[PDB]
Structures are given as C-alpha cells and as structure tokens.
Protein: Glycosyltransferase
Organism: Listeria monocytogenes
Amino acid sequence: KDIKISVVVPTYNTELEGLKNLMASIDKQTMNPDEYELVFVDDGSTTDTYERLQEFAETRPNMTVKQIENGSRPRNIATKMAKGEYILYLDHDDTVFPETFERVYNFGKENNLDVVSGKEVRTNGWSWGWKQFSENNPHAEEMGIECLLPMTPHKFYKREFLLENDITFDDGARVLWEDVYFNSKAFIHGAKVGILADYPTYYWIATSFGRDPHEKWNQINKLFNFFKDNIKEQRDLDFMLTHWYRSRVLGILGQWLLKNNNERIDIEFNYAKKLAEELIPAYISENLDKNNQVKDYLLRQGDLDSLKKLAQIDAGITALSYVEDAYFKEDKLFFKTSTKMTYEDKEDFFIEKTADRMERILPEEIKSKLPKEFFDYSDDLAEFTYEPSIKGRNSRATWKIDGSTSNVEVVNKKANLYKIEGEMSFSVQINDYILDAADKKQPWDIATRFTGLGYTSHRALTIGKILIKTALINNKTMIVYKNASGLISLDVGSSVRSIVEDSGVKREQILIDKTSGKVTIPLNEIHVFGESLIEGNAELKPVGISDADPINVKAKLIGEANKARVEVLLGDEKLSGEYHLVTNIQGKKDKQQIKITL
Amino acid sequence: KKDIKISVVVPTYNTELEGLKNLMASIDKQTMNPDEYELVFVDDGSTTDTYERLQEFAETRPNMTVKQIENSGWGSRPRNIATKMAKGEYILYLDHDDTVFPETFERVYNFGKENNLDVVSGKEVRTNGWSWGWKQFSENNPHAEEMGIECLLPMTPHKFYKREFLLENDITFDDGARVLWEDVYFNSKAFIHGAKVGILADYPTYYWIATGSFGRDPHEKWNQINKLFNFFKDNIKEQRDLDFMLTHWYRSRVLGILGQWLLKNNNERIDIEFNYAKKLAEELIPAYISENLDKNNQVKDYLLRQGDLDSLKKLAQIDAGITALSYVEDAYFKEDKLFFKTSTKMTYEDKEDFFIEKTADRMERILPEEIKSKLPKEFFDYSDDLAEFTYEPSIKGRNSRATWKIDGSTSNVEVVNKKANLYKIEGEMSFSVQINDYILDAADKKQPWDIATRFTGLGYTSHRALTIGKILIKTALINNKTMIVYKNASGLISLDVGSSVRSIVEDSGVKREQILIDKTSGKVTIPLNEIHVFGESLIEGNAELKPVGISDADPINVKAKLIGEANKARVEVLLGDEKLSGEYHLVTNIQGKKDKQQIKITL
C-alpha cells in the first residue's frame, strides 16, 4: 500500500510519555492508519531514549525509528528515509485536526501540488493568514511568492520535490527564520503551491537566540542578502524586500521606540539605517503606505528624534466596534455595529483638511522636514476595510464572516477636523464554522477587523449595556451575550450559560397534568426556529424541609411552532405538596425559583 | 493652667500603632498652641498592647489623659465617658486611624467662636472617591441651621461640637445596644435641640481614612433601617426636616437596593431584603415622598409598592452601566494657568451611546413595552428634566486626598438627535486650573494632582477621572513651580507639581546642539526644548558626572540649578573646581528626579 503522508516526529523533547501525548492527535485522523507513517529519529542512551523507544515502535505498525552517528540534520535524514507522498514537520506540543491528512492529500493529489499551504491555527489572536487563508486556491503560485505566507514550516511538502531540489533545513549553525529560507527555496525552484483554507490543518500551540541586537541585525542582514542572491523573479524579490523591510527594519521605528532603552535604540537604529542604504533600493519605498514612507525618509536622514516624536503622536490609534443591534432571525444571528478611529478607545482620531489636502495632524517642526506627499491622505480615503470575524474559544480557529455590508465615511466633526466613522451589518450561520464534532458545543467570540491609512485594528466586538438573547434553533441552544470581559460571545450547547435561566420562565403558565405525570414550563424570551428536542432532567425538593434530599426526574427542552417549553416527567413519583423545581438542561441549572404544587 | 478650646476624644480598640502615631503627628502639627487643647483617650479592653502603649504616651504629654473601660463592646460607651471628662469648649470625636489637618483646630475654633456655633461641620476628606459632601462643602456658611437639617450632611461624627451643648441637652451616643449609623442619631439629635450650625468649607479639617461585620446580615440590616426611620418619626419636630430625612434615606437605603444591588446578590438574599423594603415603604414612607423624587426613583418606588420584583430586576439590567466619561480635547498652559477643553456623552460603560426617545411631545426613557404599560406615563417622561444637566470639573490632591470644585468653568449639554427618533446627550466644557487655589498647607506645594469631571442628569451622577487616549506630556515653569500635565499610568489626567513623579527636564527635552560650555568659569548651560516658561524662577538641584565608557564609575556630584527667565528655561551646571578631562555623562537631578536625555559633554 502506498503511503500518502509521512509525519516527521520531533525529538526536541523526546520524553516517552510525551510521544504518548502526540499519538492522540494523530490516531484520531480519519485517514486509514496504514496510509500514513510516523518517522522518528534519535541519538541517545541505550534505554530511556532507545530501548523503550523501539518498544513503542514494535506496537505501532506505521512507526519507524533510526539512529544517527552524531535538531535539523535529523530532519534531513527523516526526509530521505520517509516513503510518503507528502511530509509534515510536526513541532512539539503542536496538533493536527482530525480530517487534516485526508483533505490535504486529496487536495494536493488532485491538483498535483508540491506545497499544500493549509490553514494554520494559533492559540492567540483574532486572525492568522487573514489574506491567504480566505478561499481555496489550487493555483496559488501564480500569485507570486506571497502565496506561501505566512511562511511557517507547518505546511505539507511533496517529498520528491524537496529531495530533487535539495531543499533542506540549514545544515549547521542555528539560524533565525529557517522556515522563511525553507519556503522561499521551495518557491524559487518553481513549486506548484495550493492553499487549503476551508479546513484548519495545523494547530501551532503557544509555548532566546536573537535577543542580542548584534546577532539580530546579523541575522536580518543574512536574510536580506539571501533574497538578493537567490530570488530571480523581480516581482517576487520586490515583494519580499518590501514585506520584510516594512515589518522588521521599519518595524522598529514605531511603538518599539517607546518600549526600549535609549542605549539599545541607538544600536538598532544605526543598523536599520545602514541596511536601508546598502540593501533597499529607493523604488521600494515608493510602493509603501504614507506612514511607512515617512518612516523610511526619516530613517535615511538619521532623524531619530523626529521618529521618537512621531511614535509618541501615533501611540494608541485603533478602531473598536460597538454593537448597535443584535437579534436572532430564522436560523441566524444578526448584528449591526459601528466604529470609529480613536486614541485608545477614547477621543476621536482626526485628520485635517487644508485646501485640497487631507493632512495627518503633525507639529510644524516635523511637517517642515517631510515631503508634502507623505502626510497627505487624500488618495487613501477610499481604501478603508471593515469586516467581521469569529473565533472558536476551544478550537482557536478564526474565520472571516462572509456576506457583510459595511460603510465608512470621512465626517467633518468640528472646524477643519475630520473623523473616520464606520458602520456594518452581518449575520452568523454557525453551521459555516462547525467542521469537527467537537465544534458543536463551544463558546464563540466575535471580532471586527478595520484597516485604513496604514493602520489595522482587529479587535473583539464589545457592548456596554447588558445583552442576553437566547435561541433554540434546530437542536442548538444559542445564547449571544456580553461576556465577563464586556465582549460579545455566542454560547452554543450550554458550555457556559443556562438557556432556561437566560430565557426566563412564564411561571404562571406552568401546567401540571397528574394523570400523565407531565409538568410543562413555557420559556419566556427565546427565538425558536425549527423543531428541537433536548433531553435532560430536573430536581424536586419539598418546600418546607431544610437540606432535603433531591428527587431526580427526567425532563426535556422542546422547540415547536416557534415556542419553547420544558416538560418534566414525574414517572412513578406520586407526590403531594409544594416542591421546588430546578431544571438541568445540558448540564446547566436555572435559578428561576420554580415552585409547583402536587 | 489656661482654658482648653478643643478636646480630642479618641476611642481605641486594637489600634494599629502606625495610625496612632500618624494621628499624634497630625495633632502635633496643629498651629494651635498645645496648651489650649487636650487629648482624651478611652479604650474598651483592647486585645493588643495599645493601652500600655497609650500609658507611655500620656506620661510624656502634659495635655493627654488615658483611661480604660471595664467592658469590651462598641465605640459609643468609650466616647460618652471621654466626653464627660473632657474640659474643652468644643469636642472632636477623632477615630483611632484618622488624621486632622495642620490648621484645623485654629480655623474651626475661630469660626465657631465668632459665630456662637454649637456645631462646626468642617470639610471632610476621604481616601477614595472624587468628592465628599459636594453640595454642603461648597461655600462657608455660618448660619447653616436655617437651611434645615440638611446642614449637617454628611452626618459623620467628625465635626466639632460645643461640649456644653451636648451635656446640657444630654446628647450622647447610643450605648444601650450596638447600632448602625449612630452618628446619624447623634447629628439629628443635635439639630433637634436647636444647634446653631456653621459649615467651614474652605479648609479641609478631617481625613477619614479607608482601611480593610455587624450590619452585614440581612435581618440585622433591616432591623436597623426600621429603627432609624422610627427614630425620625418620633423625634424630629419640623415637617420640612422630617420630609428631608425620610426622602434622603428612602432614596439611598431602601430604593438603593433596587438597582445594581439586584445584579450582585443571590435570589435568596434578594427575596429577604425586597420583602423588608416593601413592608417599610408601606408602613413608614408616605406617598407624597415619591413626589419629591426623580423619575427613575419614582419608578422604583412604584414597582416596589406593587411587589413587582421581576420588573425591577429587568430594569436594573436595562440601566446597568450608564455613565458619562470625559475626554480631553485640548490641554495647554497659558500665563500662570493650565487650560482644559473636555467633551463627554452619556454611554453604557464608555461604549455605545445612551439614548432617549421622542414620542409625540415627550422625551421618554427607552423601556420594553411590557414595563412601560405598567407605569404611569409621567414617570418615564424626561421632558421637564432636560434642562437640569450639570457638567463641572474637580481636582484631588493625591497625597492629601482633598477634593475641590474647580471654579469658573463653563459648560454646555445638548440633546442631539442621532438617528430616527433617538437622542443622545453630549457635553462640552472649558476650564482653567490656578494651582495656587488648592495649596493651603506647605505639604501641598509638592504633590501630584488628579483631574476629574462631575456629570449629573436624568437622575444619574457620574463623577469620574478625566481621561485621554493619546500620549499627553506638557511641561511648565511658573513662578518657581515645576508643572507637568500628563496622561498617567492609568490613562488618566494628572498634574505633577514639584517633581513628585516625573522629571521636567526629561519631559521637556534637551536642545543638544545648544548645550554651551564656558571653561573659564566651569559653567555648562543646558537649554530646555519644549516648556511653557512664565515669570522668574530659580530652583537649585544637583548633577552627576560619570566618565563615558568606564563601566560602573564613581559618580561625581556637583551643583546645578534650574532657571526660568524671559520665557525660557535652562539648567546651569557649575563644574566647580573638580578634576575633569574627556567626555562625560551628565545627568541632571532637579527636585529628586533624573533625566534620561543622554547628555554628553567633553572637557
């Protein structure tokens, strides 16, 4: 049988019980176990890293171990002895999602891809690979080298392709951004790259060399020289220069100046200036945004003092979205939101209209040093974006929410000052983001992404007033709410909140049918769509007694004809008197103080 | 042995010694001669060693007497016995962990003596909060009792009472049993017996310090609330005064549980306290008290008497978080003042706008129809209350904790149609700070000051710190006062005077190219870049020299001075007659703060 996928098992921490933890994520793959293999490699003592090593290997038929006569050179030997069509270089503590192997191989084989850039998930943040992991693209390499961004080493690589172009991790010295070098060489050698965006493939879990400014800028110089000497297509070289110049070199001329001591600032500033002069052509800054053109111009002038002042003037610019309306309709959750650019969610962010120019507000001393074009936002006032996103609080996967309509205008607030105001409406069909069984019961967090004038604000949606709205939709309990942090969350499956408590109870419409032993408890405020039956139980306690033992009984939450109710089955009980009733639906109890008389 | 003007009555019980010496320190700093006041200490069987410690104090102090009580319960019996053995004209009940201000005794006695005052209600300061007694402590009032019983609010026991007045009317603290709000009984009894009351508002007299469980149980709590209201009904004689106390305490303690309190307590506790509240309203509170209340309190009163707990819980959910947060739109120094322009608007938790609806001719509160239908229509109509908004600035000293209204401000509040029939509430304000208005003691000269704004309207009161988002750092040198207005570590506005937190050299910046050196006199002059210089100023400090490149060198301290002259500021450093050759690091040290301006001079 042909091997479809070979996973290179890491040995950074080769604790045997740690390899036990790793097989859990891999044994849950939907792919047949005999169509993938696990490739291990070590160089240790006779027992705790070798004898109990192959003891574990003789149990797994698809596991292989081999020694080395000496953490990257191990990866090269694993690549050569592997037999799978694609190779995954799995890092420690990282996990893959249950359908990754099947979906990656099908996608790569059908489209004959040398690299499958699968959607990657990180613990923190509201996005990862926002631009690239939007839609599936089986012909991504035609877009240029940026199709491989973000250049993590967590993609699926065609094994034949790596061996035929001798694409390996750097043999000796520990190098920064070896994944950048690796994925760049893959593209340089004409890799067919496909982007798999509709299913998360890799979970990069969150868990020193290069902190030295001298080694840091030594490594930055190496990376830029690697680009200059190895990239042959000018379009691709221009992108890599522009991308890394903006983020690493110019990326220290903003708020980084306000966070480091003056002694380290002086060192890294001269490093950045020398690199810009020796390595970055002048035309590169021409395709940059206005704020970075300012940074580039002041860098080449060596004007560190102006840059320190501009960092002070720019600190805290952001855009936080407020919920203006939220409701359930049909089987979806609808949102209306508003936003505006501010300083730290407080006073408005302003630009200034002087004549035909929409000017960045700067002191006169700095305005006189800059070319006029670099603080005129006139040409950029129609390039605002405003989109919604969502994140599973357990899976950590983030997704753009499609189908939104937005509007951003430049509004004259007072005198010649102008603010930037945005509005947006969108809906959530939660089934769009339920891909694994575990996603069915999960809290979800909503965010908004706002970009414009060189700034990007991707922040959690918030509301000030208490919002609690519930829904019973096709056997899914849904609760949208202002969570404990003041941010918008959608609880599905009662993982945090009780839908009965949040919906309230019409305690005066409670029905008791003693012949059929059925108690009916109608819910008050709740959107009910489709038919729903969710089984649970309830507790009865006699009213007068203290510390009374509970009477356990079955119960069910029913959605029917756009109305919801809990029916409690008394069964054999045969009771008399007044009892407290507490419903327990999906593990959550209500605090509605229900009393019934039997 | 001469006449005693002030008797300080201090009840002790497991006193923290640090606070006891801080109390003594604030007494010793009184401008009044020690011969004219006395300290009367009584403890009720302290379980620590603070009585033996008290005996030691009393031996070295001729104006201090200590006595111990044979029982160990509450603080009222100690105060009653000390009052009897006091000999002064006025008595101050100073708690064991509070302090007084240096000119308190002199100012209170003069004010009370020149006006034949039975009670002097002096300005009282509290650790937390942006105001205390905001309405009563605005202006001096030597004839306050003509205002009715409100003249004694807030009714803490930290006033100065004519001793004879207390003894002749038999006004004592309740020692029959433990009581909540014994000071309210005390101050009400003082007013009932015809006390001439004067309010001394222009100098802080008492600092009630906050630290780290008798009336915390629900049954005990409402037993005390019933006791308090029954006391009002039986002892107050004037109708106007009875109505005020009924209204004030009904609003704050009974209706005060029908708001955010409903969101912070379990259902069992809510049921107990709501039942008590409903019964007290029906038995003790007349119906006409509701007519003295704002709209939102009329709604709470109405639903309370209906027993509609579900609507009150829903209303508390709808009202949660309504506030008004002020933002700085401009801040700059001009002449000898600091000017501000601020904006605010009513929001939920500083997020989305708060709205009211326009229906027909009425500006209404936005309420779910289920609740609107139960209420009389006048109670959710804000129309006649739309011109009562207030928007004022205030200041607090971070060390003294004293708060003041910043006088001379101008503000405007508009009701603006945002969209459809929904209206928001927007305020704007301009004001200026003359810091000399708030410096009364020498300690106030070097202090950080925090700025705040007070916004009231439609029944809401929002007194919160002024904030700003952008980095704000502006410096000034005004008549020997270093002044820095800045966004502090919390994003709030602070005014550092005297270099108590920040360095004016570091925040102003250094014109490095303009650094001058005169070797003939050893004078190095360092000009300051951005700084508002008004008037003449000269502040002597130090400077520290270290050889460049020499790791961990011996510092060379030398004299320096900050000078303000002709709208310019500079630091002149005198190398004196020191050994110097080569390039050196120069670090200025003005008023205890050092700069990080990388000053290098080569000699």
